[PDB]
Structure formats: C-alpha cells, structure tokens
C-alpha cells in the first residue's frame, strides 16, 4: 500500500523489468549491426561475380574475334572437326558464364532475405524504445518518492540489485 517497504518493493519490480527490457534491446542492436555486416559481405561477393562475369565476357569477345576468320573459312573449306572445336569452346565458356550469372542470382535472392530480417529486427528494435523511456521515467519516480520518504540508501541499492 503506502508502506515504504511496499513502494520500494514496487521499485525493484520495475527496475528489473527495465534492465531486462534494456538487455533485450542491446541483444537486438548487436544482432542488427552483425547482420548488417554479413549483409555487406554479400554485397561485396555479388560485385565479385559481376567482376568475374565481366572478365569471362571479355575473354569470349577476343576469342570470338580470332575464331571469326578461321571459322568463316573452315565453314566453306569445309572442315567439320576443326570448326566444331571452335564452337565447342565458345559453348562451354558461355555455359560457364551462364552458370555463374545464375549462381549470383541465388545469392541476391538470399541477400534480400537477410535484408528483410534487418528491416524487421530494426522494427522490433523500435517497438521497445517507448517502453524503455517510460520504465526509466517510472523507476526514477519511485526513486524520488522513496528518497523524499524516510526511505534511504542501503535498501535502495538492495532494490536495484547492487553489490
């Protein structure tokens, strides 16, 4: 009721709630920053693929340049096996590229998944900011109350779990 022990008893309850609400928030904040890091690597990895692919395409372009003379000629010569070789190269090459291009696409999809999670963890992270403010305010109020009350230090520390 109006018992100092009863008020201090209430204080302990709210302070605890507050610390717990606070700890949980901290846990989320780390998780958010951490995932934003792992999210960076993914972005970087994608650039790696983009770079890799851009490379192979340049290789393809230049080999295609030299092949063109020979190929156009072997066609009318007409050497089957020789020009066959030429097409077989460009093929496996383009099926290396076409293979990688899809390989990053799976990562991009895999990326947006994590990106959403951060959007959501950030959301939950904002749900708590209000309560934290309030609990802190509240707890501070009981402190002032008990403080102006005869109630005093040592037991206050007890109620705040201080050693």
Curated annotation (Swiss-Prot):
Record's comment on post-translational modification: Phosphorylated in response to signaling from activated receptor-type protein kinases. Dephosphorylated by PTPRJ.
UniProt modified residues of type Phosphotyrosine: 29
Function: Regulatory subunit of phosphoinositide-3-kinase (PI3K), a kinase that phosphorylates PtdIns(4,5)P2 (Phosphatidylinositol 4,5-bisphosphate) to generate phosphatidylinositol 3,4,5-trisphosphate (PIP3). PIP3 plays a key role by recruiting PH domain-containing proteins to the membrane, including AKT1 and PDPK1, activating signaling cascades involved in cell growth, survival, proliferation, motility and morphology.
Domain notes: The SH2 2 domain is required for interaction with FBXL2 and PTPN13.
Binding partners and assembly: Heterodimer of a regulatory subunit PIK3R2 and a p110 catalytic subunit (PIK3CA, PIK3CB or PIK3CD). Interacts with AXL. Interacts with FLT1 (tyrosine-phosphorylated) and FLT4 (tyrosine-phosphorylated). Interacts with NYAP1, NYAP2 and MYO16. Interacts with FBXL2; PIK3R2 is a substrate of the SCF(FBXL2) complex. Interacts with PTPN13; dephosphorylates PIK3R2. Interacts with XBP1 isoform 2; the interaction is direct and induces translocation of XBP1 isoform 2 into the nucleus in a ER stress- and/or insulin-dependent but PI3K-independent manner.
Family indicated by similarity: Belongs to the PI3K p85 subunit family.
Associated disorder: Megalencephaly-polymicrogyria-polydactyly-hydrocephalus syndrome 1: A syndrome characterized by megalencephaly, hydrocephalus, and polymicrogyria; polydactyly may also be seen. There is considerable phenotypic similarity between this disorder and the megalencephaly-capillary malformation syndrome.
Protein name: Phosphatidylinositol 3-kinase regulatory subunit beta
Source organism (scientific name): Homo sapiens (Human)
């Amino acid at each position: 009721e109006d018992s100092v022990e009863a008020v201090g008893a209430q204080l302990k309850v709210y302070h605890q709630q507050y610390q717990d609400k606070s700890r949980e928030y901290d846990q989320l904040y780390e998780e958010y920053t951490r995932t934003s890091q792992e999210l960076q690597m993914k972005r970087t990895a994608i650039e790696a693929f983009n770079e890799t692919i851009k490379i192979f395409e340049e290789q393809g372009q230049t080999q295609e340049k030299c092949s063109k003379e020979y190929l156009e000629r072997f066609r009318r010569e007409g050497n089957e096996k020789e020009m066959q070789r030429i097409l077989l190269n460009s093929e496996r090459l383009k099926s290396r590229i076409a293979e990688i291009h899809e390989s990053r696409t799976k990562l991009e999809q895999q990326l947006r998944a994590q990106a959403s999670d951060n959007r959501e963890i950030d959301k939950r992270m904002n749900s708590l900011k209000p309560d934290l403010m309030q609990l802190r305010k509240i707890r501070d109020q009981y402190l002032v109350w008990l403080t102006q009350k005869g109630a005093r230090q040592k037991k206050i520390n007890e109620w705040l779990g201080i050693k």
